[PDB]
Amino acid sequence: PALKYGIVLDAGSSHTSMFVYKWPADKENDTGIVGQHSSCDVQGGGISSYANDPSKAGQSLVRCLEQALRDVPRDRHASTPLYLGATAGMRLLNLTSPEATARVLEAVTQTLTQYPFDFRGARILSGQDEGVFGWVTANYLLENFIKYGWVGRWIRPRKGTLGAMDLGGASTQITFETTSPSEDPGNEVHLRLYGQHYRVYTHSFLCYGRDQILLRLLASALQIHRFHPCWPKGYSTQVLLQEVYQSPCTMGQSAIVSLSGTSNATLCRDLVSRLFNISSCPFSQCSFNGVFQPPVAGNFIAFSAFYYTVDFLTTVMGLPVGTLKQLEEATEITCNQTWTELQARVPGQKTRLADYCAVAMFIHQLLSRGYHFDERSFREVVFQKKAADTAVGWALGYMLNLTNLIPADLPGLRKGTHF
Ligand SMILES: Nc1ncnc2c1ncn2[C@@H]1O[C@H](COP(=O)(O)OP(=O)(O)NP(=O)(O)O)[C@@H](O)[C@H]1O
Numbered sequence: 562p563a564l565k566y567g568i569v570l571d572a573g574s575s576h577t578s579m580f581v582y583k584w585p586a587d588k589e590n591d592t593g594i595v596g597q598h599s600s601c602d603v604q605g606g607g608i609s610s611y612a613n614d615p616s617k618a619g620q621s622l623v624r625c626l627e628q629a630l631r632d633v634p635r636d637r638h639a640s641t642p643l644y645l646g647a648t649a650g651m652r653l654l655n656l657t658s659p660e661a662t663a664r665v666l667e668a669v670t671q672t673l674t675q676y677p678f679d680f681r682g683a684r685i686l687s688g689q690d691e692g693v694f695g696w697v698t699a700n701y702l703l704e705n706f707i708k709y710g711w712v713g714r715w716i717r718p719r720k721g722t723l724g725a726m727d728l729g730g731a732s733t734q735i736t737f738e739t740t741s742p743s744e745d746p747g748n749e750v751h752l753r754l755y756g757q758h759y760r761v762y763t764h765s766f767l768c769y770g771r772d773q774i775l776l777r778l779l780a781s782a783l784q785i786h787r788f789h790p791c792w793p794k795g796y797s798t799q800v801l802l803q804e805v806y807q808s809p810c811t812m813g814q815s816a817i818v819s820l821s822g823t824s825n826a827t828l829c830r831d832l833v834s835r836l837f838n839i840s841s842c843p844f845s846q847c848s849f850n851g852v853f854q855p856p857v858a859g860n861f862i863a864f865s866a867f868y869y870t871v872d873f874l875t876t877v878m879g880l881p882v883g884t885l886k887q888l889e890e891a892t893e894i895t896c897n898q899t900w901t902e903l904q905a906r907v908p909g910q911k912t913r914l915a916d917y918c919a920v921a922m923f924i925h926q927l928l929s930r931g932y933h934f935d936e937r938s939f940r941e942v943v944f945q946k947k948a949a950d951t952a953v954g955w956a957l958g959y960m961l962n963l964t965n966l967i968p969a970d971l972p973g974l975r976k977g978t979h980f
């Protein structure tokens with residue numbers, strides 16, 4: 562019909578992606594109505610990777626913005642909002658240099674303002690935003706905010722919502738509806754969506770994204786072993802120590818050292834275990850690092866690097882991961898492969914290949930020791946990256962919020978029929 566459009570640039574730690582969304586101009590407040598029209602993946606690094614060359618951050622966006630001009634009808638350009646939101650790459654850069662951060666944001670802002678779209682700003686999202694908006698995305702797309710039943714016979718309990726686990730490159734988020742009392746205001750979220758209240762727990766672990774965890778494990782391996790037990794036997798590389806220790810995530814842990822793998826699953830497990838501090842909890846219950854967390858409950862979607870890693874274990878290693886024990890076994894087996902054994906499973910490009918043992922191990926420990934999934938609760942986790950032909954992430958939920966497309970109440974309160 563008469564369609565409206567909106568554009569979000571997702572400026573992550575390791576990449577920028579552009580999403581174009583579209584929806585009917587007159588059904589626009591219905592849940593699940595907005596869908597993904599197109600997307601584009603910016604070549605090269607995330608915007609924070611241009612900390613020392615900020616004008617390039619803007620320029621990196623140009624090819625995808627030219628695509629947006631083709632993707633969105635010209636008569637709609639002027640009224641199509643365009644947002645850029647940045648995540649943990651930029652949060653980390655702000656810790657190093659607020660000035661470099663400001664310049665990168667100035668540069669993207671300058672570039673986006675040249676385009677005919679209604680540009681509504683480039684902002685850095687908080688960890689909370691990032692978590693909650695991915696949770697809104699998943700549940701919006703799946704129509705979990707619908708009030709199921711009919712007059713005089715409403716389903717009770719209300720339709721459950723899908724928890725969200727996001728494993729990015731520099732941070733990781735966990736978000737789910739909970740009935741538990743909140744013990745920490747920084748974790749407590751209250752939403753009013755379609756006349757309903759959702760009590761939500763969220764937390765973002767900075768430095769617990771995939772790329773930063775790989776750096777911490779490398780730093781740890783260099784310090785403890787002078788070999789890398791999580792790398793496969795026969796794999797070695799020259800490590801630039803400058804790069805290992807420049808991150809805020811590792812600076813608390815001979816310009817070049819050779820480092821070789823040893824396919825040692827048990828020492829890998831030991832190395833990964835040190836990532837999680839379970840020694841104190843100022844609350845009734847914690848995940849790890851003294852962070853409050855109520856018991857995990859309900860179904861969960863695990864996307865981003867949770868998905869990519871499970872996809873590798875299932876599709877490439879050909880291993881089942883339906884249970885925590887299976888995931889643990891799949892990890893041991895992956896970790897015990899030699900570099901030649903591993904490469905033979907991957908006829909094509911091998912970027913990331915040596916790191917799968919470490920990431921799978923981290924994921925297993927994060928879920929079981931960090932979040933305290935057990936067999937019963939893990940049965941309710943699904944690994945997917947797409948719902949209703951839309952990429953799952955925080956971008957849709959962010960656009961929904963900023964365009965005010967999710968009503969707090971239904972029109973006229975649906976005559977009070979949901980009271
Ligand atoms: N297609 C892929 N296959 C395997 N791994 C991938 C793929 N795409 C991205 N990754 C890796 O998975 C991790 C998470 O990717 P992504 O979710 O894009 O992070 P991000 O948004 O750049 N980081 P953050 O700012 O912390 O959310 C990164 O370490 C990527 O290198």
Ligand SMILES: [Ca+2]
Nearest residue numbers: 573648729730
């Ligand atoms: Ca991300």
